[PDB]
């Protein structure tokens, strides 16, 4: 098979910067390389076909070069709408093979999270469960720590954190933290604290409530 090694795995580019993705094939494929752009919830979109051929409608900031084994895909100047996964696809011989993909993220200014905590709803407590939810919204960069405290004591077990993808409007990230307990144990404690520590502010952002 023609192995297709796409490089690098991930990129963080600021607005207006040039994007360079390389793609190395294990066999000579002339210029039968194609570049697809994949966004969450949508099928792949072909941007450049064999012979560095820009597809109709694709903006001119997209281009490609290479003949033989070494190929390059370039975004002349980065836009926010270009945040996506990119794949090369060799069309020279069967079987068709894709590159592993490049995850391209936008490099924006740092932004602190907006934190809010939510006690269990009345409906869930009636069903015998108790989830405490904390939302950490619109922060950058993506790395963030969340710490749960029950009556001041740190709690590690029973926590689930889900990260959202980079927002297309403001390029920030958001994270959901959920601490699930039994209703019996939830009623045995008074205060529930959600502590968010991000690179932006050295001291944590603390939101809490008391079960009253």
């Amino acid at each position: 098979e023609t192995t297709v090694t796409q490089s690098p795995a991930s990129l963080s580019m600021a607005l207006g910067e040039k994007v360079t993705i390389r793609c190395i094939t294990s066999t000579d494929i002339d210029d039968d390389l194609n570049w697809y752009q994949l966004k969450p919830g949508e099928p792949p979109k072909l941007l450049i076909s064999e012979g560095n051929t820009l597809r109709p409608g694709v903006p001119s900031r997209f281009s490609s070069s290479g003949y033989g084994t070494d190929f390059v895909f370039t975004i002349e100047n980065m836009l926010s709408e270009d945040v996506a996964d990119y794949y090369c696809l060799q069309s020279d011989n069967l079987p068709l093979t894709f590159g592993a993909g490049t995850k391209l993220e936008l490099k924006r200014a740092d932004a602190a999270p907006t934190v809010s905590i939510f006690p269990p709803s009345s409906e869930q407590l009636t069903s015998g469960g108790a989830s405490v939810v904390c939302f950490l919204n619109n922060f950058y960069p993506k790395d963030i720590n969340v710490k749960w405290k029950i009556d001041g004591s740190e709690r590690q077990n029973g926590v689930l954190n889900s990260w959202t993808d980079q927002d297309s409007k403001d390029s920030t990230y958001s994270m959901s933290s959920t601490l699930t307990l039994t209703k019996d144990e939830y009623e045995r404690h008074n205060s529930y604290t959600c502590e968010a520590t991000h690179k932006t502010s050295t001291s944590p952002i603390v939101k809490s409530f008391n079960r009253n």
Binding site: F118, E123, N137, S162, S176, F209, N212
Partner: protein, 217 residues
Amino acid sequence: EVQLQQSGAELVKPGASVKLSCTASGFNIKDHFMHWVKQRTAQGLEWIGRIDPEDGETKYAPKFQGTATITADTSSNTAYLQLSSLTSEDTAVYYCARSGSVSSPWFAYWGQGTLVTVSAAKTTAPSVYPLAPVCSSVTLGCLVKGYFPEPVTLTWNSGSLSSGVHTFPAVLQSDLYTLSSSVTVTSSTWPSQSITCNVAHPASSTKVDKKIEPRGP
């Protein structure tokens, strides 16, 4: 206008087989190649194989021979993908694609995708819980617990409220999926104006609406 319409999501038991469909319009599949592509999380894209509906000849990627069978019906302009001996590593979105032309072998048009879930877990409807503030701006929440399988569709005010909305990827905690969503509006908007969480789970044919009310308590 070229359009490719695939069949709906599938939940299959491990070791069983599934057959996906893809109906074409705007072109005759007899004149092109139909392709199937596997899109798995963290696995990028993977070519499965192709068929020439004019004579029925097929070609497969080596990892899919003896596990995938592609067929086509020209009278209905439909291409089919059968996957047998399914394992959990075959849980993916499966795309149907058309080649550019006889002299353009790359993928030109795609279908919307078909989710195949390979698992023995039973279908379970979600519980939907409204999350009001703790009792400037106000953030509201919605919690969707204990459902299977993916996907669930969550909208705010049936979708007319999308600004300031953050729906988070579902996580699988012991058999069942949990999903949450947050919406942020100006304090003069809520609770003056009504805000409702709408959750749909087609696999269980359930539709739930939960209006977020201020806590009493």
